[PDB]
Nucleic acid binder design. Sequence first.
RNA 1: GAAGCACCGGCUAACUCCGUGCCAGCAGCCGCGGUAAUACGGAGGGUGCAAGCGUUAAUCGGAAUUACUGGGCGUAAAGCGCACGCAGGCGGUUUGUUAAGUCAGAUGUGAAAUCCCCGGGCUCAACCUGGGAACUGCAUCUGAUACUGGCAAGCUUGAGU
RNA 2: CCUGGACGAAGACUGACGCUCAGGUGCGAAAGCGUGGGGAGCAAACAGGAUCCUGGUAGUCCACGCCGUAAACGAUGUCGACUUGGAGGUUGUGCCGGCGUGGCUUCCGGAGCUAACGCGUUAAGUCGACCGCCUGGGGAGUACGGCCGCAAGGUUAAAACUCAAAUGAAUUGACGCUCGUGUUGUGAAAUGUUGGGUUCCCGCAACGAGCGGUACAAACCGUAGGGGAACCUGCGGUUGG
Lengths: 225, 158, 129, 205
Amino acid sequence: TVSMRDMLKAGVHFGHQTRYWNPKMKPFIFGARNKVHIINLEKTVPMFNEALAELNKIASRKGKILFVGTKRAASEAVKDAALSCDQFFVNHRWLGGMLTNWKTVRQSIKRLKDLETQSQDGTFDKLTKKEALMRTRELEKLENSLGGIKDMGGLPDALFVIDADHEHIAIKEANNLGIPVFAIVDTNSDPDGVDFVIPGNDDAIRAVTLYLGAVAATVREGRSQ
Amino acid sequence: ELQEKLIAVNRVSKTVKGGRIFSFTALTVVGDGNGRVGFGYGKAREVPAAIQKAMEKARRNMINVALNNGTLQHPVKGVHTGSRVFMQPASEGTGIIAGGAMRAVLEVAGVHNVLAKAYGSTNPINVVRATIDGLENMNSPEMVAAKRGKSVEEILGK
Amino acid sequence: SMQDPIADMLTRIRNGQAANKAAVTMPSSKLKVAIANVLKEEGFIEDFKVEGDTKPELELTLKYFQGKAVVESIQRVSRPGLRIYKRKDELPKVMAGLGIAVVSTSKGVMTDRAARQAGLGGEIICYVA
Amino acid sequence: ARYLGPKLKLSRREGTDLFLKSGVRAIDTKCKIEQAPGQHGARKPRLSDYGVQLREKQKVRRIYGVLERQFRNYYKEAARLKGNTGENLLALLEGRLDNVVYRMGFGATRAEARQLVSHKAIMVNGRVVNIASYQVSPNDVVSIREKAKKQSRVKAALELAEQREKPTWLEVDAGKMEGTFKRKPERSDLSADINEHLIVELYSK
RNA sequence: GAAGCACCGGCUAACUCCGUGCCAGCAGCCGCGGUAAUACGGAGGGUGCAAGCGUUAAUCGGAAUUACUGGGCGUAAAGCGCACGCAGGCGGUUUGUUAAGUCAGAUGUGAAAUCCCCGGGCUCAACCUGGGAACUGCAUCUGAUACUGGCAAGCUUGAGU
RNA sequence: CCUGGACGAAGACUGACGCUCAGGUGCGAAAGCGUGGGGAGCAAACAGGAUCCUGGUAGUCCACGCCGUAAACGAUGUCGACUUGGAGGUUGUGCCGGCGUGGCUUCCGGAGCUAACGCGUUAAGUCGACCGCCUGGGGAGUACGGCCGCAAGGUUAAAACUCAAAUGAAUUGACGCUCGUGUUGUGAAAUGUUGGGUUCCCGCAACGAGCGGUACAAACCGUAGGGGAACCUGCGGUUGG
Ligand SMILES: [Mg+2]
Ligand SMILES: [Mg+2]
Ligand SMILES: [Mg+2]
Ligand SMILES: [Mg+2]
Ligand SMILES: [Mg+2]
Ligand SMILES: [Mg+2]
Ligand SMILES: [Mg+2]
Ligand SMILES: [Mg+2]
Ligand SMILES: [Mg+2]
Ligand SMILES: [Mg+2]
Ligand SMILES: [Mg+2]
Ligand SMILES: [Mg+2]
Ligand SMILES: [Mg+2]
Ligand SMILES: [Mg+2]
Ligand SMILES: [Mg+2]
Ligand SMILES: [Mg+2]
Ligand SMILES: [Mg+2]
Ligand SMILES: [Mg+2]
Ligand SMILES: [Mg+2]
Ligand SMILES: [Mg+2]
Ligand SMILES: [Mg+2]
Ligand SMILES: [Mg+2]
Ligand SMILES: [Mg+2]
Ligand SMILES: [Mg+2]
Ligand SMILES: [Mg+2]
Ligand SMILES: [Mg+2]
Ligand SMILES: [Mg+2]
Ligand SMILES: [Mg+2]
Ligand SMILES: [Mg+2]
Ligand SMILES: [Mg+2]
Ligand SMILES: [Mg+2]
Ligand SMILES: [Mg+2]
Ligand SMILES: [Mg+2]
Ligand SMILES: [Mg+2]
Ligand SMILES: [Mg+2]
Ligand SMILES: [Mg+2]
Ligand SMILES: [Mg+2]
Ligand SMILES: [Mg+2]
Ligand SMILES: [Mg+2]
Ligand SMILES: [Mg+2]
Ligand SMILES: [Mg+2]
Ligand SMILES: [Mg+2]
Ligand SMILES: [Mg+2]
Ligand SMILES: [Mg+2]
Ligand SMILES: [Mg+2]
Ligand SMILES: [Mg+2]
Ligand SMILES: [Mg+2]
Ligand SMILES: [Mg+2]
Ligand SMILES: [Mg+2]
Ligand SMILES: [Mg+2]
Ligand SMILES: [Mg+2]
Ligand SMILES: [Mg+2]
Ligand SMILES: [Mg+2]
Ligand SMILES: [Mg+2]
Ligand SMILES: [Mg+2]
Ligand SMILES: [Mg+2]
Ligand SMILES: [Mg+2]
Ligand SMILES: [Mg+2]
Ligand SMILES: [Mg+2]
Ligand SMILES: [Mg+2]
Ligand SMILES: [Mg+2]
Ligand SMILES: [Mg+2]
Ligand SMILES: [Mg+2]
Ligand SMILES: [Mg+2]
Ligand SMILES: [Mg+2]
Ligand SMILES: [Mg+2]
Ligand SMILES: [Mg+2]
Ligand SMILES: [Mg+2]
Ligand SMILES: [Mg+2]
Ligand SMILES: [Mg+2]
Ligand SMILES: [Mg+2]
Ligand SMILES: [Mg+2]
Ligand SMILES: [Mg+2]
Ligand SMILES: [Mg+2]
Ligand SMILES: [Mg+2]
Ligand SMILES: [Mg+2]
Ligand SMILES: [Mg+2]
Ligand SMILES: [Mg+2]
Ligand SMILES: [Mg+2]
Ligand SMILES: [Mg+2]
Ligand SMILES: [Mg+2]
Ligand SMILES: [Mg+2]
């Protein structure tokens, strides 16, 4: 859905150095210039379009999509695109066991809803020099961590991942539960862990927006009907 | 719904400055009897607590095994760290002829007639892992007809 | 020194199949082509191509069905150290017939199934499953 | 060569009804069938894999009144024959002359039927056979001899057989006090609760 | 006129009481006994077999624990201190026939009994017996010759100049 | 001065002439011996002084002969083929410092393998050829016999008897505290509760909760010597410190 020239402007073709190259990414590399691998944009387009097509199919049948982005730029970028598609996101550090320890994670969510209730509706108005400040610190830390999954209340049907090597923990949890995984696999990542591999650069800020924009819009398109 | 069996219970120990701390570990296997079997390894301090943990682990992490009316499709060799496991299909009425650990796995999996043998170490957790590994890689005649370009008639009837 | 070319042919297949190779190329011979023809007929490979005359080289196309190797176990049964000859009524059944046994009969190279039909024994070249 | 002790002890140990008594009274009315015999019978302890296999083997042996040496020979013949080993083992046990007498209802109990056979009161195809283990072939007519038709045991046992389920592989003629062995019973023709694969596994070892 | 023997700590089916107090003893292994011992001795109860039941000896199995089927050798026992090399074992790739190995068929033989299958006779069984199958072998003959070997030419990738 | 091997470039040439090897033959650290020299330093033994020090013989050196043993180790036999990759050293060579193509070598690491450790294109991965060697610990690499040696001894190599263990690797401890779930490991177990800063914060395969050298359960190897021997010393080697 994105032209090859546009992806070149977005820096999708760019990759990491050859020193840190992952051998598994050999078929998806066009070449190497200035000791930097170049991602073959020809391979990416059919894979990305098919991945987008699968996202439309699973959203239209009322699934659930979770976005996982922890990069410095991607953290804010995913959150802006997350609310547009009305889907869930993890902008901050992925906590180990978010999917595996769903029962424990559920209790964290149940704590959060009670915590927000007192500060918004409960009107506790109690400080005691200890309680109020610690509860606000609890609220601010919980919101940063599990803010994007408050409205989900269940196992996400599929996951979208940025920088799959950095987010290996989320992928491992998804592979254990059979949840399909979508990830932007760079040259130094492991493509075998992803079901629908998207060979793109996850470090370029403009590229991340192109990924998020092309994905979030499709989710709205599939959910429109 | 599905049959569950406890295989082994062992009392393990660790040493702290105060003294020795003890625990009980329980190995269980569960299965529906129709080609699905899973093994669990619970670890707690109280024996009833440990066996429940093993069942919970065994209830999930199941595998699907093709069965030919209660026997294996072809003889197979299961191998794990120390245990060598050989299993072989048998005729109707032979029953489960296998070791203590192997018999429980084959019963809950739905295997009725089978000839089996264990070589090397017979540590129960290693034996059941080898038996699980030896059954998951077994392929039905439909599966080999899928990999190759021939139909079921050509695979066997030919 | 390479004292068994047939085993090396199987080893290249097994290594390439496990390494997710696209194709495996090796020096060609009359016996190797006969073996490769049998595999293609049963479907364990896609196609074999022989290129060159002064120094022929055999090219084999591997087969993967669902992200997995079709050739799961290829084994050299008879070897130069210990030749193995079986009669027609002693022909082994690999995986109770699911696999094949390449048998060199007096009428040529074929599978164990064909040898039983033709009533011929011979040297068991390899097991394929 | 037999068991001459209390019958209900065997049933109590096995936990079920072994039909060792005529069944005039309910089994619980004469004993605490839910409790094992002996001082420590009230307690219910664990039982290993060998224990349940041994209990099942002792169950069928005590049902048909067969010792270990005679029962072991039956296993060898059953495993030697074609087809299912367990089904043949039950069929061989069910083919015993005393068992046929009990199933046809001439004796109230197999032990009573065993005494009827031993005392030269059973004629098979017009021939007096007093061997308890003597096998009965299909389409063979067993009968009570005219000398033994005046006994009240035969008359009383007919009523008890009527109350019990009548086998479908046998023909009974109480008027003439003779029967016909129609066919070998199948696995379904017998009680499902009995397990034969345990016996086969136990004797394999 | 006709039921005994062994066992009941685990392995391994079956437990309490009393006496004894690292004594007396038990024991295949692990191991039990110094004051509540289901392990000793006795009793009660139970379990396993049964005209037998234990113990001892011997063989095989379990023992893949001499692994041909069917094991190992960095550290658990195990790569010779290293090299050259005779006998030996094994040997790239083409054709031609040789048909020794191997393969197919035929023939002779492989005593009977035994084992196995199907029936028969002893009231059943053991036992006896009819007919087969088997006797996995050897030899000769006739074929096939893809592979292996012998023989004759080559070929160049192995090995050398 | 004489001489062996290896590697690279580009050809020519021979046309399977190959690989592995029981016996066999040669080689083979240090120590030790035979014959004759040499002998500065160092230094077993020895002598003396102390509670290590001084002095110093064999030996170390040379010619020739013998000995044929080492933790002679990478505790990994030789030969061949195939199988993801990174960083470095060391020697070639091709092309325009870049760019490929060789040989040997070091580290890290994937699949795979392994009991684990770990190995990992120089395999302990995947197969093939051949040889050597092992099947409980101790007795014992000892006795007897053969062979070899001037001797020391070497090599080949038991049995009786005795014990039910010996051993490898890894783990938990010694020399504020736990659980639930999850996760890693075949497992014992670890993570949590390993780090930075200040009970707290942050990072974080954890998330939350309830509470307040050991041989334990320097060492060794080969050799040589001891008359101040509760073991010690000379020489070379090993890390299994
Ligand atoms: Mg233990
Ligand atoms: Mg063992
Ligand atoms: Mg053990
Ligand atoms: Mg154990
Ligand atoms: Mg072989
Ligand atoms: Mg008798
Ligand atoms: Mg049978
Ligand atoms: Mg048996
Ligand atoms: Mg018991
Ligand atoms: Mg007392
Ligand atoms: Mg007492
Ligand atoms: Mg005691
Ligand atoms: Mg005992
Ligand atoms: Mg006693
Ligand atoms: Mg008694
Ligand atoms: Mg008794
Ligand atoms: Mg007698
Ligand atoms: Mg024995
Ligand atoms: Mg054996
Ligand atoms: Mg072997
Ligand atoms: Mg071994
Ligand atoms: Mg060693
Ligand atoms: Mg060596
Ligand atoms: Mg040697
Ligand atoms: Mg030597
Ligand atoms: Mg030696
Ligand atoms: Mg050599
Ligand atoms: Mg030679
Ligand atoms: Mg030759
Ligand atoms: Mg050849
Ligand atoms: Mg020819
Ligand atoms: Mg011939
Ligand atoms: Mg001929
Ligand atoms: Mg013949
Ligand atoms: Mg004949
Ligand atoms: Mg026999
Ligand atoms: Mg008769
Ligand atoms: Mg008869
Ligand atoms: Mg006969
Ligand atoms: Mg006859
Ligand atoms: Mg005949
Ligand atoms: Mg004969
Ligand atoms: Mg011919
Ligand atoms: Mg030929
Ligand atoms: Mg030839
Ligand atoms: Mg020179
Ligand atoms: Mg020439
Ligand atoms: Mg020429
Ligand atoms: Mg030699
Ligand atoms: Mg020398
Ligand atoms: Mg010399
Ligand atoms: Mg010297
Ligand atoms: Mg000298
Ligand atoms: Mg001198
Ligand atoms: Mg001097
Ligand atoms: Mg003086
Ligand atoms: Mg001095
Ligand atoms: Mg001097
Ligand atoms: Mg001095
Ligand atoms: Mg002196
Ligand atoms: Mg001198
Ligand atoms: Mg010499
Ligand atoms: Mg040595
Ligand atoms: Mg060294
Ligand atoms: Mg060595
Ligand atoms: Mg190699
Ligand atoms: Mg490494
Ligand atoms: Mg190994
Ligand atoms: Mg010994
Ligand atoms: Mg000696
Ligand atoms: Mg001599
Ligand atoms: Mg001499
Ligand atoms: Mg000597
Ligand atoms: Mg000697
Ligand atoms: Mg570990
Ligand atoms: Mg685990
Ligand atoms: Mg492991
Ligand atoms: Mg140390
Ligand atoms: Mg010494
Ligand atoms: Mg030293
Ligand atoms: Mg050295
Ligand atoms: Mg050692």
